[PDB]
Design a protein around this ligand. Structure first.
Ligand SMILES: [Cl-]
Ligand SMILES: [Cl-]
Ligand SMILES: [Zn+2]
Ligand SMILES: [Zn+2]
Lengths: 260, 67
């Protein structure tokens, strides 16, 4: 029995709003709930102003909880895979590493000033994706209680938006692929047999990330085609029809979840 | 025996084990003990390869090791 790739699993960086040299790194399948636990309590600690935290960045797209924890622990250790400047440089170092490169992760910033420091790449550490929230926060004002609260509330809304949207997009895309399978008249791009659930090799399918592209195949067939120092996992294969770049991790995400 | 030769050998063992190959390109976690047992069963030479080298190979090949 295969385990599904998580709908969402991310490794996040928190920066205290008031204590701006305090950071925290963790990993989670639900960053909204997690940020409430960090800012309030774990379940229903004297306060020294470390809370509330701002979630300033999150790396997500991990193929498993295990992989996210590997990234988290490497990021915290600072690791065999190799100030705010150092925390952000560690992200780039890990995204360049052979192991995490296969995952085509997404680095998302909720704060534009933090994104700018990362981009400035002070240490010249420079397939992963980088994104920045619409209405990302910029310079933080922590001079008053109301300013601190305003930052916390706006940051929560940004984290909610990214998370709920990511889940809604995967939901929508799963439904569209399922409809393709359900028609039972698609055929495999490579072996030409009808696409139908009937043998893991026969029931795992691969789709183009463009839902209006008609490329569909057996996962095994796509794997074979893409794979023709030696490697095992495809890296940035292109759709044989529209030539767009695919993320193998996303291909597997939908493949396994449709079968389950 | 160079590390390149060992890595090629281990990769070739994986490619001859269909179930394990599919699990790896589907990013499925596997314990080191389970992996080494599957490899050794394809070629007993795996017995002579140290754990640290096997772990370097798993990192390079993107194999996810579950403790
Ligand atoms: Cl929630
Ligand atoms: Cl506190
Ligand atoms: Zn096929
Ligand atoms: Zn396509």
């Amino acid at each position: 029995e295969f385990q599904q790739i998580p709908d969402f699993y991310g490794c996040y960086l928190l920066q205290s709003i008031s204590k701006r040299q305090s950071f925290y790194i963790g990993s989670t399948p639900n960053p909204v709930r997690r940020l409430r636990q960090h800012n309030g309590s774990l379940s229903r600690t004297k306060r020294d102003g470390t809370r509330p935290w701002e979630m300033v960045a999150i790396v997500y797209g991990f193929p498993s909880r295990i992989a996210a924890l590997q990234f988290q622990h490497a990021w915290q250790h600072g690791t065999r895979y190799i100030s705010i400047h150092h925390k952000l440089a560690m992200i780039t170092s890990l995204l360049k590493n052979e192991y995490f490169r296969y995952m085509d992760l997404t680095l998302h910033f909720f704060n534009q000033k933090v994104e700018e420091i990362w981009k400035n790449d002070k240490f010249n550490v420079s397939n992963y994706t980088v994104s920045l929230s619409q209405d990302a926060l910029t310079e933080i004002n922590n001079d008053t209680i109301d300013d601190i609260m305003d930052v916390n509330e706006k940051n929560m809304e940004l984290v909610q938006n990214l998370y709920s949207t990511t889940l809604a997009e995967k939901t929508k895309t799963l439904l569209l692929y399922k409809e393709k399978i359900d028609t039972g008249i698609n055929t495999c791009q490579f072996c030409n047999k009808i696409i139908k659930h009937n043998n893991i090799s026969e029931n795992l399918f691969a789709f183009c990330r463009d839902t209006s592209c008609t490329f569909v195949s057996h996962l095994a067939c796509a794997y074979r085609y893409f794979m023709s120092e030696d490697t095992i996992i495809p890296q940035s294969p292109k759709c044989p029809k529209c030539y767009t770049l695919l993320k193998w991790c996303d291909v597997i995400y939908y493949s396994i979840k449709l079968n389950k | 025996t160079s590390k390149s030769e060992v890595f090629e050998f281990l990769t070739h063992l994986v490619k001859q084990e269909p179930d394990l190959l599919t699990r790896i390109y589907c990013f499925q976690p596997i314990t080191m003990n389970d992996l080494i047992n599957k490899l050794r069963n394809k070629d007993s030479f795996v017995d002579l390869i140290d754990d640290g080298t096997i772990r370097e190979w798993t990192d390079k090949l993107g194999i996810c090791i579950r403790s």
